[model samples]
Target: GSHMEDFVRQCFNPMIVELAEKAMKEYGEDPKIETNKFAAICTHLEVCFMYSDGGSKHRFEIIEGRDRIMAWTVVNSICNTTGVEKPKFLPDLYDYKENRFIDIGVTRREVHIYYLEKANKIKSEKTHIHIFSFTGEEMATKADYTLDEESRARIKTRLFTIRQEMASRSLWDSFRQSE
Candidate 1:
């Protein structure tokens, strides 16, 4: 089966941009640091983009597992324990082709770009890579941290806190709504 670069680009790139914009509007001004919010938004948008655009099925499951635990915990402890029906965690990605949500872990930056580059190399491949420089900006903040064991652990802890704060804010909104 052949992949179309234009289709991939057209589908994923804009979707991520829109999703990020919405996330920024909702959470950008929180007391939490801008970089953390940006990273979280990027993470969610990436998940959405990959799943919507026909990424590998195996990868999506891995990606969902990374964040799904928190949602499960909330459903079990807060929703069930309190006698409310369990809430379903929103699927991070939706497939346009199948008209269904699919979890294709993550189309990681390196993997995506690598695949794009490969696509460009094949004369028969349906995609052409738009010429662009790989600016290190996106990789800058988390790169060094991800490569080291200790740093990775620290970064993971920080990420957990950021997610907790985001969830807490949503819970607060729900409380306010009921009042």
Candidate 2:
């Protein structure tokens, strides 16, 4: 077809696995379907942003933690597409006219997020995220957080809440069984 197997096996598959594992280790909890979902969102969004899709809201209906986090990187400069003037649904940051954010630079070993706030300047959030393969069962199990950065602390707390919110609704549910 399109070297599909090669890309899936050698590239895409491992990325998904890496993302899931990274989530597990960082969140400090057992694996959950939601974790995999977030990992999925991260890669897909990376695909979305990188491909110049600009996080199309029309294509994405549910933009939650992973989705929103992914959306944050839809930088204005590289957004491709003729009809679109700006990347959709991305967050706003200081020193940017149109909600620019830190570069992923992107990861599983060195994934981190940054934001520019008026008082906080450049604040750091999330750390060491990886995206790799998926069977959904592997994540079977996850930062260097600064305590003094109150503004960053609040953002961290909110991210924690978001991650908790992203947790599997039913602990017994094994998403691996689904298609």
Candidate 3:
């Protein structure tokens, strides 16, 4: 009891001063050792657009793992490590048809005119191309990015209203000047 108690008191489990000698060897004085706190997990929500030329070929056009990826976060923290839910802003490009988009709420001040170029033929046959978000944007690459309620409502409203009509027009423009 005397031996351990004395030694522990001599060298408290907290701070240390023996480093004064370490300074002489390392050519520095009063080493003044340091300490601190930190913690963080990498959670991401990548998002983007996809299109299908209104054909059967669009189903597998966006290949998973290659053209796209889906991974879950794992907590190796032995116990009390609960699982996390997937980000809510993921844009899904699947529905009854090969070219429907699930409304993803990401409000940004950007613009594109090609979508509203809804040109039509005699009966309105269409052409659509696959567009993807493989290109990294700062926000989609950001950690813990969230989709708020208003954004969701806006996204859904945009999807159901003008955006769907705009979606149809891209097929109208999926052509090359020479073609």
Candidate 4:
């Protein structure tokens, strides 16, 4: 586990700290939480993203993992609001397309994008902008991020607009149903 600790310390810890700081600003500090826990969550997200690609040869795992981490963060927020402390064992929350361990929703796709680019594996493209937008819109449609009625409605409206654009541009049919 030394190598894992080193990886987190050297690679993801800085971002984790920045996220923690930002979180502290958005939602005041909780004395029970520590930076180490935040680092752990970041480390887990990295690992999940890496595995999300299935293997080195495939590339969609990053997208899949990104979606998973987003969902995980939503679940964490839900748990926090309910006064339910996340368990140390990190049990799987809701099973969607993949299993997710609830934690602070601090992970960002941009960090994964950086790592992927560093590895010379590009995930996005000009042609797929609508697809990416659709992914986000669909995720928002899930409404797992918030229980607020207004927020969910807003997300639905965004999804509707994106879908309309996709249809108008004939991009909707281009998407694989399996995706």
Which candidate has the highest TM-score of all? 1
lDDT of 2 at 119: 15
lDDT tens readout by residue for model 2, 67-144: 334544433333342223343233222112222222221122212221112113323231211221221111100222
Candidate 2 wrong stretches, greater than 4 Å: 1-11, 32-99, 102-179
Report the error of model 2 at residue 49, Å. 5.2
Candidate lDDT (C-alpha), each:
0.34, 0.30, 0.23, 0.35
With candidate 4 superimposed using the best TM-score fit, by how many Å does residue 131's alpha carbon deviate from the native?
18
Index of the highest-lDDT prediction = 4
Per-residue C-alpha lDDT of model 4 across residues 1-179, encoded as one tens digit per residue: 33323333544547544554444444455313443343334434443332233322432212222234574565567456654444332222322332333221222233344333322332212101101122333221123431234533443444445345545655444322212
lDDT of 1 at 49: 40
Kindly give the stretch of ten consecutive residues in candidate 1 with the minimal lDDT sum.
Answer: 126-135
lDDT by residue (1-179, candidate 1, tens digit) is 11222222333356554555455565435312343334435544553342223344433222232234553553354434435443233334322222232222222235445444434443322111211111221221112211234433333343344345444545323322321
lDDT at residue 106 of model 1 (Cα atoms): 21
Q: How high is the lDDT of residue 151 in model 2?
A: 32
**TM-score per candidate, in order?**
0.26, 0.22, 0.18, 0.24
Answer with 1 or 3, whichever has the higher lDDT: 1
| Stronger candidate by lDDT (2 vs 3) | 2
Ranking of all candidate structures by their TM-score, best first: 1, 4, 2, 3
Candidate 3 residue pairs in backbone clash: 53-128, 127-171
lDDT of 3 by residue, 1-179 (tens): 33322232233222222322232234333222211000000000122221222234434222111112231111111112323222232223332233222222222222122212221211222222221111211132112223333432433343333223323544112211111
Count of residue pairs whose backbone atoms collide, per candidate: 4, 23, 2, 2
Question: Model 2 Cα RMSD, Å?
Answer: 15.6
Error in Å for residue 162 of model 2: 24
